């Protein structure tokens with residue numbers, strides 16, 4: 001297939017942090033970025049597959065992006081403006097994905113901006129103190145305005161005269177100002193009782209609409225400054241869209257993210273598959289093929305498309321609300337990719353959706369915190385173990401509707417590893433940051449869970465305190481278990497009773513990740529290859545085929561590696577052997593890259609730099625050999641191709 005991006009959620013409680021220009025380009029603000037989605041025929045997808053593609057990220061802001069508006073002037077649809085809590089308002093070109101200009105005029109946290117419908121280079125920004133700036137970027141000018149000492153929530157330039165701008169406030173007040181008259185208040189619009197969420201001008205000449213947290217929409221005659229009709233709706237963000245096609249109809253959000261189309265001529269109509277939590281923005285987009293769509297962003301972290309002719313949802317783009325901590329592919333369901341997210345939901349992604357590139361199912365029940373580990377049962381379908389940062393281990397029947405089973409036992413600290421292995425029918429092993437590895441019974445998960453350090457102590461000859469275990473990986477045949485430790489040690493234990501056969505002292509810091517090379521290779525000696533990463537940059541590979549066959553009486557110490565992979569410049573969070581190759585490793589690092597290695601020749605192959613933060617996990621696509629999935633603390637998962645990469649090594 002082609003690349004995909006599982007992007008961060010659109011930001012919440014912003015009057016305008018997303019917009020769309022006609023033809024088919026949609027942009028929404030998410031974390032520190034603006035993500036770009038070409039929507040329509042020009043997105044290039046099979047008739048049946050939803051016509052959208054995430055194509056671009058606008059990279060450059062330092063803190064939360066508070067506002068985003070496109071330039072809607074014909075032949076200039078490629079410009080757009082952003083505001084950010086870093087005090088910046090940047091002008092962007094979407095073809096280059098770069099900044100054209102900016103201004104740090106605002107001395108207080110910006111609330112919103114808006115690109116004038118009439119003046120080709122005028123962007124009007126307002127902050128939480130009530131200060132409004134006007135910025136003409138092609139003429140290099142900047143008019144300062146102060147209207148009143150109140151918290152600006154929204155701001156909409158008039159489509160019908162260059163000088164009028166409506167401003168809504170946290171306390172319900174709405175006013176219309178004139179820039180050419182130095183911010184004079186022309187119309188005070190008295191009526192609202194609470195937070196103004198949106199202001200939409202009538203598209204034909206003038207009237208004016210406002211949605212407020214006081215559960216009413218209001219239309220105003222901006223001539224006689226009076227309110228000529230009030231609409232009460234049947235937790236709330238109340239955003240509006242006045243369609244140019246139906247100048248007599250009006251779209252609004254409603255409780256629970258429900259969307260309405262009212263009739264100006266007490267009457268409403270329902271959309272639809274609907275949103276489940278409050279909706280923040282609504283963006284009209286007319287495709288090349290003349291379809292009238294409307295894009296909606298929502299607290300439920302879905303980005304939905306609506307066909308205004310049918311008022312049904314054409315597709316949904318889901319998003320991630322926290323770090324992508326974990327990626328697990330199922331061996332029973334081949335395309336099934338489990339994602340552990342910091343926002344407390346597991347994502348299972350059918351990466352083989354015949355007619356849907358983002359077929360993702362969320363799992364709310366049971367989980368109530370950062371999912372930091374995941375593992376599929378090797379044989380049972382739908383069987384998915386997860387661990388959290390509250391130390392909770394859990395099991396999940398992902399075909400079922402029903403809330404998961406929780407282990408009666410919690411780890412003291414975060415759950416970083418989960419592996420299935422034989423009991424010491426199949427047992428769940430969970431490792432916590434405190435250093436305990438526990439053995440769970442899936443049959444009776446509420447019962448006793450045995451800390452395996454007691455058997456390690458019984459079956460070996462111990463007179464010291466055991467290490468703090470930080471990572472567990474079983475070998476492919478289910479006969480050798482490796483534990484990584486805080487000191488950097490890795491310990492090799494043999495099948496029935498965790499007999500220790502070997503200790504590797506190669507790392508000098510905490511081990512984060514161990515992976516054994518797969519058995520499906522084209523040669524035996526490879527399944528005994530172990531890859532490991534620690535809080536240091538250098539990755540090691542070790543060849544344990546001697547000591548496992550040697551089956552020693554006493555445990556042996558190893559101080560020399562089989563292969564050394566230097567390149568990364570920060571800790572290694574995850575490593576994975578390619579299932580389609582022999583000795584090909586991918587590694588995720590805190591240096592924000594992922595490196596593909598041919599581990600046998602100590603050769604760097606390619607380096608993925610598409611992430612915007614520290615990487616936490618990597619998983620090879622189980623069917624495409626040049627395709628890999630990544631997860632980082634940028635609230636993203638990228639599905640990228642080895643062959644599309646520009647660099648072979650990690651930076652420095």
Ligand SMILES: CN1CN([C@@H]2O[C@H](COP(=O)(O)OP(=O)(O)OP(=O)(O)O)[C@@H](O)[C@H]2O)c2nc(N)[nH]c(=O)c21
Nearest residue numbers: 325414416417432433470471510511512513573574616
């Ligand atoms: C403490 N860690 C951290 N860690 C790796 O680091 C990532 C983030 O962990 P974290 O909760 O930020 O731990 P922390 O030490 O605070 O991270 P940092 O100090 O780098 O910010 C995880 O995705 C995980 O792969 C770990 N992995 C294993 N196996 N065992 C561990 O004890 C730990």
